[PDB]
Enzyme design. Structure first.
Site, PDB file in Angstrom:
ATOM      1  N   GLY A 195       0.801  -1.208   0.000  1.00  0.00           N
ATOM      2  CA  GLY A 195       0.000   0.000   0.000  1.00  0.00           C
ATOM      3  C   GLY A 195       0.836   1.262   0.000  1.00  0.00           C
ATOM      4  N   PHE A 237       2.417  10.134   1.495  1.00  0.00           N
ATOM      5  CA  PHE A 237       3.674  10.360   2.193  1.00  0.00           C
ATOM      6  C   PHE A 237       4.365   9.078   2.629  1.00  0.00           C
ATOM      7  N   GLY A 238       3.666   7.944   2.664  1.00  0.00           N
ATOM      8  CA  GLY A 238       4.256   6.706   3.127  1.00  0.00           C
ATOM      9  C   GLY A 238       3.909   5.564   2.199  1.00  0.00           C
ATOM     10  N   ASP A 278      -9.440   8.431  10.045  1.00  0.00           N
ATOM     11  CA  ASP A 278      -9.334   7.807   8.732  1.00  0.00           C
ATOM     12  C   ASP A 278     -10.124   6.508   8.708  1.00  0.00           C
TER      13      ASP A 278
HETATM   14  N1  LIG Z   1      -1.640  -6.207   7.924  1.00  0.00           N
HETATM   15  C1  LIG Z   1      -1.994  -6.037   6.621  1.00  0.00           C
HETATM   16  N2  LIG Z   1      -2.367  -7.091   5.863  1.00  0.00           N
HETATM   17  C2  LIG Z   1      -2.716  -6.959   4.571  1.00  0.00           C
HETATM   18  N3  LIG Z   1      -2.738  -5.787   3.919  1.00  0.00           N
HETATM   19  C3  LIG Z   1      -2.391  -4.645   4.550  1.00  0.00           C
HETATM   20  C4  LIG Z   1      -1.992  -4.704   5.966  1.00  0.00           C
HETATM   21  N4  LIG Z   1      -1.707  -3.439   6.326  1.00  0.00           N
HETATM   22  C5  LIG Z   1      -1.907  -2.645   5.241  1.00  0.00           C
HETATM   23  N5  LIG Z   1      -2.318  -3.365   4.182  1.00  0.00           N
HETATM   24  C6  LIG Z   1      -2.630  -2.850   2.825  1.00  0.00           C
HETATM   25  O1  LIG Z   1      -2.080  -1.544   2.635  1.00  0.00           O
HETATM   26  C7  LIG Z   1      -2.979  -0.738   1.871  1.00  0.00           C
HETATM   27  C8  LIG Z   1      -3.007   0.671   2.450  1.00  0.00           C
HETATM   28  O2  LIG Z   1      -3.099   0.558   3.868  1.00  0.00           O
HETATM   29  P1  LIG Z   1      -3.541   1.781   4.819  1.00  0.00           P
HETATM   30  O3  LIG Z   1      -2.636   1.819   6.027  1.00  0.00           O
HETATM   31  O4  LIG Z   1      -5.031   1.656   5.016  1.00  0.00           O
HETATM   32  O5  LIG Z   1      -3.281   3.130   3.974  1.00  0.00           O
HETATM   33  P2  LIG Z   1      -1.811   3.694   3.620  1.00  0.00           P
HETATM   34  O6  LIG Z   1      -1.759   3.642   2.112  1.00  0.00           O
HETATM   35  O7  LIG Z   1      -1.814   5.084   4.208  1.00  0.00           O
HETATM   36  O8  LIG Z   1      -0.844   2.744   4.283  1.00  0.00           O
HETATM   37  C9  LIG Z   1      -4.345  -1.407   1.934  1.00  0.00           C
HETATM   38  O9  LIG Z   1      -4.837  -1.632   0.611  1.00  0.00           O
HETATM   39  C10 LIG Z   1      -4.130  -2.739   2.622  1.00  0.00           C
HETATM   40  O10 LIG Z   1      -4.583  -3.803   1.781  1.00  0.00           O
END
Ligand SMILES: Nc1ncnc2c1ncn2[C@@H]1O[C@H](COP(=O)(O)OP(=O)(O)O)[C@@H](O)[C@H]1O
Ligand SMILES: Nc1ncnc2c1ncn2[C@@H]1O[C@H](CO)[C@@H](O)[C@H]1O
Ligand SMILES: Nc1ncnc2c1ncn2[C@@H]1O[C@H](CO)[C@@H](O)[C@H]1O
EC number: 2.7.10.2
Lengths: 547, 275, 126
Positions: free
Chosen positions: A275, A279-280, A396
């Site tokens: 994902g 910014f990250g 969020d």
């Molecule tokens: N523990 C996890 N297991 C599977 N997928 C994850 C996990 N943590 C994050 N993701 C994936 O990362 C993507 C973005 O996560 P999120 O933290 O919601 O937004 P960001 O892009 O700011 O990190 C999501 O589509 C999700 O599928």
């Protein structure tokens, strides 16, 4: 295979050089393309060397902008964990021959007027085992890697005691004489089962050790202490030569009949992008210190190189706010990986193959009944209520942020936007400039940066409108709001959104939504946060719906 | 060709592609009046008798006056060979200084053998503190050039620096093997490269500066004053430079007036200009 | 186009929202009367000698309170519908202020023309 010092290594195979030969490839990190010089003269300096105890480089690879050193692969692996695993089985001639062969390799290195500033156990890779029989193991020296001359002042203090204090005083004072210091450090290291030298000592304590001009470490043998002091000299021009060391060790080996929550970047095996935000960026990694691909899949969050220090502090805040959290419906945290120089940090979460409800629902139309997403709503309400009881506002709360653990359980993540409220206020005011799900927010959250616990009720209602409709793109709150507000445009959108909301406009009734479900559900978007419902009430109503 | 050994010509067919239709002509090593051709997997040989300047194929009662007249005649027919048939399509011609049995190996000519650099690039770095960046001069093909001056190489020598465009860092390869290929050349009609400069991510070729400038606008400006021996010597010197280039098995795909820079004027007096 | 009274924007690009008329913020509708609003903003800039202390950016920011990126245009519209405009620039003559505030009428049809602006300014010369 794991991240090195600003370097990533993957599995490799070379063709038409026999054919189909497995090789080792090393990729310089894109964040540090400025150091492509040291990259170049490190790739070049290994062209001239030719010894059986050194790696073999087939050359360099060019494509796009990145580059690769194609080096020799050995299945023996590094001697570090090898020695860690069978310490009780080790023998004395074993370490004698290990030391003598690397000393001969270092003599060969100095014979060509070349420097290796990374003479350490981590750069000692095994070739053959030979423990069972009379044949001796074989080791081979790896690449020098990134020079210390470009490391930070802080990065010059963690190499203690492997680094020579002369280079610490000035990096320009590098010379071949400093290799003997790392040689002696390794000699001590192999004498104590590879135990970490100078552990439990702070950086300032190590600097005091250098400036106090005291002996770094001492063994329990008279002759070993003598030879170490002979090689551990503060005067670089007084350090004796390698051939003297070989003659001394050959003499003594017969003279002495008596024998006597953190993660490492090198064990982070990236799989696939998980994902990416503004910014990250989140990667899928496997932590395999054993190197046997039997490790545990983990979710790791990282920041882009061009992130500012303010975003670094925001990330750190994300770590401590999640660290003290403990609930059945929240992302699990395990540890933190540090980068070199303290400028980089890795946040490790749980990787759930079920993904998020944004992706889980579309591929699972028929296996969820109304009861199931009703249970999901109960779970999400419980998660927020736990969070609200801890005086946090996630800010969020989106179905895309609702990670799925099973078809009976989901969890909540993406806590980079979560903020704690102070003990003497009723809401929070945002200051950082970051993209936000404006369509998921309450009107006060759009008009005055005011965010309450009642604000998360609005986000929960939006997420429920998502969930009951199975997170349809056709029915996306993004697109639904867009079409109810007409053709809008970026910066313009929130304006018309506020206008329509003040007109009493909300998201419509989701398909097949029960009348009681709609009634309790629309209760979430009352204009006044004081007139908005609580998540305990939501749980009570949903469980009544179960009955 | 002449009396070249069979293995040589057989190998020559492999290099081009061994497609059906090609053929090579060479004089028979045993007979002065007979030419033999090798066609091509199969490799079929065919002999042609040449008598009193008349050309004709063996077994054929007709004859043709010219070798070219002979071989052109057979272009438009089909050839039957046992069970397989084919049509010739293209010939084979000699190549510069092509190594063969006819050549003689001597110690002194051994020193003139070309070097083997099939997978080798070498270059010298220029320290960033040793150069001074000056005013711009104009944008090239994805390249920018500024005024330059090199220090501690005498000292304070004006040089020419060339900066690859950041939009096209993907082509840093051709950049590299262009900077490297000029290291091996050594001729008075070619530029001199002091090396390459490294700092941050950008790079620079430090080349020789000449105040004469390009011959394009120079020739544009005084056309009415130009003379005939002027262009004769201009052509002959660049032809000699191109012969030097081909003598080292190197290619220059930008032989144009824009790549012709003047060194001295010499119009007023008997001395000739230099490019 | 030859058969319309305004224009509607579609491209996604940063725009001087503080220099635009309310319709230019609410409906992407841009008229010739819309440029009267921008001219008035530029004149407020010019007579105050383009002061950063009196920048329409900062002036609008302070009259709309602490705003935040995507949030700003919302409160800008809110205050504008409240009848809020840029204040009287320092030492601005009363006639200059009168003709000058004429540029930001809410209805583009009720906004002045640039020929009228030229006429008034040249009268000011006299
Ligand atoms: N523990 C996890 N297991 C599977 N997928 C994850 C996990 N943590 C994050 N993701 C994936 O990362 C993507 C973005 O996560 P999120 O933290 O919601 O937004 P960001 O892009 O700011 O990190 C999501 O589509 C999700 O599928
Ligand atoms: N130069 C190398 N040659 C062989 N294996 C290597 C090399 N560098 C890293 N590895 C492998 O990578 C893993 C740890 O980085 C181990 O499996 C180790 O054997
Ligand atoms: N390699 C070069 N040597 C000398 N002058 C050059 C070179 N390349 C460009 N110039 C100068 O740049 C200008 C046009 O590009 C002219 O002044 C020309 O002399």
């Amino acid at each position: 295979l794991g991240r090195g010092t600003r370097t990533h290594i993957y599995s490799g195979t070379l063709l038409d050089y026999e054919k189909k030969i497995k090789v080792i490839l090393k990729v310089l990190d894109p964040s540090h393309r400025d150091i492509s010089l040291a990259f170049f003269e490190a790739a070049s300096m290994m062209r001239q060397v030719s010894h059986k105890h050194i790696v073999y480089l087939y050359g360099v690879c060019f494509r796009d902008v990145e580059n690769i050193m194609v080096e020799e692969f050995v299945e023996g692996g590094p001697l570090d964990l090898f020695m860690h695993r069978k310490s009780d089985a080790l023998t004395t001639p074993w370490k004698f021959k290990v030391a003598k062969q690397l000393a001969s390799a270092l003599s060969y290195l100095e014979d060509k007027d070349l420097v290796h500033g990374n003479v350490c156990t981590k750069n000692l890779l095994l070739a053959r085992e030979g423990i069972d029989s009379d044949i001796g193991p074989f080791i081979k020296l790896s690449d020098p890697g990134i020079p210390v001359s470009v490391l930070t002042r802080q990065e010059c203090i963690e190499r203690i005691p492997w680094i020579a204090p002369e280079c610490v005083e000035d990096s320009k004072n590098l010379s071949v004489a400093a290799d003997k210091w790392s040689f002696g450090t390794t000699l001590w290291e192999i004498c104590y089962n590879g135990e970490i030298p100078l552990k439990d000592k702070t950086l300032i304590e190590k600097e005091r050790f250098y400036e106090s001009r005291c002996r770094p470490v001492t063994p329990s043998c008279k002759e070993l202490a003598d030879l170490m002091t002979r090689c551990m000299n503060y005067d670089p021009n007084q350090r004796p030569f390698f051939r003297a060391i070989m003659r001394d060790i050959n003499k003594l080996e017969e003279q002495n009949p008596d024998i006597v929550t953190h993660f490492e970047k090198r064990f982070l095996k990236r799989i696939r992008d998980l994902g990416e935000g503004h910014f990250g960026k989140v990667e899928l990694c496997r932590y395999d210190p054993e190197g046997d691909n039997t490790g545990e899949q983990v979710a790791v969050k990282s920041l882009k190189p061009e992130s500012g220090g303010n975003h670094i502090a925001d990330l750190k805040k994300e770590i401590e706010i999640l660290r003290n959290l403990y609930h059945e419906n929240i992302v699990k945290y395990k540890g933190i990986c540090m980068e070199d120089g303290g400028n980089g940090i890795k946040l490790i979460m749980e990787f759930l193959p079920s993904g998020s409800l944004k992706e889980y629902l579309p591929k699972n139309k028929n296996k969820i009944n109304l009861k199931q997403q009703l249970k999901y709503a109960i779970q999400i309400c419980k998660g927020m209520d736990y969070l609200g009881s801890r005086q946090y506002v996630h800010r969020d709360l989106a179905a895309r942020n609702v990670l799925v653990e099973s078809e009976h359980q989901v969890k909540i993540g993406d806590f980079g936007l979560t903020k704690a409220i102070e003990t003497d206020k009723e809401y929070y005011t945002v200051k950082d400039d970051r993209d936000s799900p404006v369509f998921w927010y309450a009107p006060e959250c759009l008009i005055q940066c005011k965010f309450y616990i009642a604000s998360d009720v609005w986000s929960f209602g939006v997420t429920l409108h998502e969930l009951l409709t199975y997170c349809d793109s056709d029915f996306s709150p993004m697109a639904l709001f867009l079409k109810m507000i007409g053709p809008t445009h970026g910066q313009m959108t929130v304006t018309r959104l506020v206008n329509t909301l003040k007109e009493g406009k909300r998201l419509p009734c989701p398909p097949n939504c029960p009348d009681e479900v709609y009634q309790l559900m629309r209760k979430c978007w009352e204009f006044q946060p004081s007139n908005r419902t609580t998540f305990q009430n939501l749980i009570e109503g949903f469980e009544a719906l179960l009955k | 060709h002449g009396p070249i050994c069979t293995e040589y010509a057989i190998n020559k067919l492999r290099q081009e592609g061994s497609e059906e239709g090609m053929y090579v002509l060479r004089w028979s090593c045993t007979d002065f009046d007979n030419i033999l051709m090798t066609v091509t997997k199969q490799f079929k040989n065919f002999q042609i008798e040449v008598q009193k300047g008349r050309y004709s194929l063996h077994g054929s009662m007709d004859h043709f006056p010219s070798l070219r007249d002979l071989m052109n005649h057979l272009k438009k027919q089909i050839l039957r060979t046992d069970n397989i048939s084919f049509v010739l399509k293209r010939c084979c011609q000699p190549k510069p200084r092509e190594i063969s049995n006819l050549l003689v190996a001597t110690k002194k000519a051994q020193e003139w053998q070309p070097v083997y650099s099939m997978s080798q690039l070498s270059f010298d770095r220029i320290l960033k503190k040793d150069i001074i960046q000056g005013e711009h001069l104009g944008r090239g093909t994805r390249t920018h050039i500024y005024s330059g001056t090199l220090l501690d190489y005498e000292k304070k020598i004006k040089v020419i620096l060339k900066v690859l465009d950041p939009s096209h860092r993907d082509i840093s390869l051709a950049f590299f093997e262009a900077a490297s290929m000029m290291r091996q050349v050594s001729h008075k009609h070619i530029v001199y490269l002091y090396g390459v400069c490294f700092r941050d991510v950008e790079n620079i070729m430090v080349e020789e500066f000449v105040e004469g400038g390009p011959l394009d606008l120079f020739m544009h400006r005084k056309s009415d004053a130009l003379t005939t021996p002027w262009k004769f010597k201009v052509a002959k010197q660049l032809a000699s430079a191109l012969s030097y280039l081909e003598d080292k098995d190197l290619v220059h795909g930008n032989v144009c007036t824009k790549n012709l820079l003047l060194a001295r004027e010499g119009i007023d007096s008997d001395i000739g200009p230099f490019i």
